[PDB]
């Protein structure tokens, strides 16, 4: 017969329906776990491309008509590309090349947020700083983050115990290397009983040449030790071997006696 034909009203898209994955390279990257970054309508043909571009994610189908989102499942960041810096949280691989900027064929690989406090960077930075690749800023900041024991996870704390033992066995061979000098500096900064005892052990296990070159303030000659008794002030205050000496290579007794000096004012 005569059906009452009626066409539906003209549709109006929303913000979700107008999203384009080829524009959200700065939105999907800072996404965390259990976060649904709605990427919008996605054709079936581009699903493989968006899945190979963001491998750390899962393409979850949220709504009809191809409406999908990307859900973070993992942080696939290598140690050399995530540990030797403190500002980079992600990078892009393309033709076997790491880049900071984005390329439409590149692949996003991101770093754990505050990865240094997870301890995963200890093994890489232990070898990267011990050598000619030693960056003063990066390695000093890494030692600082290591002594930040309260901001680390349980994995971080056990890796920190292991790192303490490893640095102790390393710096006992030679403390003149820059990484061990910064480790002694931060052990001074910590200023606990364990830290002072560790400094003392590290400096006592040093070789005779090292003691003769660096520890002439802690180990004085017999003439200077005899002369130091003729004055009431501690030896370290007037001793020229303590006036100009690397403060990181002093024993804790000497480091403290250097502060007990009375300054005439």
């Amino acid at each position, epitope marked *: 017969v005569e059906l009452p034909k009626r066409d539906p009203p003209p549709g109006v898209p929303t913000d979700e329906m107008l999203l384009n994955v080829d524009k959200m390279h700065d939105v999907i990257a800072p996404a965390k776990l259990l976060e649904y970054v709605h990427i919008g309508p996605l054709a079936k043909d581009k699903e493989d491309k968006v899945k190979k571009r963001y491998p750390e994610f899962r393409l979850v189908n949220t709504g009809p008509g191809g409406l999908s989102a990307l859900l973070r499942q993992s942080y696939a960041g290598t140690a050399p590309n995530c540990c030797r810096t403190f500002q980079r949280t992600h990078y892009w691989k393309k033709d076997g090349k790491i880049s900071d900027k984005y390329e439409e064929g590149a692949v996003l690989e991101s770093c754990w947020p505050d990865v240094h406090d997870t301890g995963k960077c200890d093994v890489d930075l232990f070898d990267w700083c011990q050598g000619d690749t030693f960056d003063r800023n990066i390695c000093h900041q890494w030692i600082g983050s290591a002594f930040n024991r309260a901001d680390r996870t349980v994995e971080g704390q056990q890796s920190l115990i292991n790192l303490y033992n490893k640095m102790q066995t390393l710096c006992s061979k030679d403390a003149s290397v820059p990484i061990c000098e910064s480790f002694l500096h931060h052990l001074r900064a910590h200023n606990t009983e364990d830290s002072k005892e560790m400094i003392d052990y590290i400096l006592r296990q040093q070789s005779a040449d090292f003691k003769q070159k660096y520890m002439r303030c*802690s*180990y004085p000659t017999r003439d200077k*030790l005899e002369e*130091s*008794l*003729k004055y*009431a002030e*501690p030896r370290e205050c007037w001793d020229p071997e303590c006036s100009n000496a690397n403060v990181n290579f002093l024993l804790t007794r000497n480091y403290n*006696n250097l502060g007990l000096c009375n300054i005439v004012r």
Partner: nanobody
Framework: EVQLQASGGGLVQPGGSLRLSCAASGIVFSNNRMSWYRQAPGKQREVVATITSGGATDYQDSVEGRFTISRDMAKNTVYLQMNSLKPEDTAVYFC????????????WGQGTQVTVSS
């Protein structure tokens, strides 16, 4: 009239420890640098340890870390704790007191024998 009688010495095997004591009677530690000397038969005396009017301690490099010079102000007694004693440490250990700025007030005390037998 000034009493610096050292005591506590004796015979110990290598590695052993000894606590030497020197109780002053006529000298206040708040005015004097207190030193422990030793003298071995055949050689001259040498400073083993010292502590200023304040708790600032200093040690000879040969005995650094093995010896600890302590001070008790209420009892007015200076101690020397000797750990990991070696045969090189066999000597007569005695007390010494130098006034802070009087200089000429250098008082010595009777010694005590310390022997190590390998």
């Amino acid at each position: 009239e000034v009493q610096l009688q050292a005591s506590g010495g004796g015979l110990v095997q290598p590695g052993g420890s000894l606590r030497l004591s020197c109780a002053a009677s006529g000298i206040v530690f708040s005015n004097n640098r207190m030193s422990w000397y030793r003298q071995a038969p055949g050689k001259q005396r040498e400073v083993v340890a010292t502590i200023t009017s304040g708790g600032a301690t200093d040690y000879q490099d040969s005995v650094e870390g093995r010896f600890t010079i302590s001070r008790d102000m209420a009892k007015n007694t200076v101690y020397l704790q000797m750990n990991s004693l070696k045969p090189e440490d066999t000597a007569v250990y005695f007390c010494n007191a130098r006034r802070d700025n009087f200089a000429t007030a250098i008082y010595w005390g009777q010694g005590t024998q310390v022997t190590v037998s390998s």
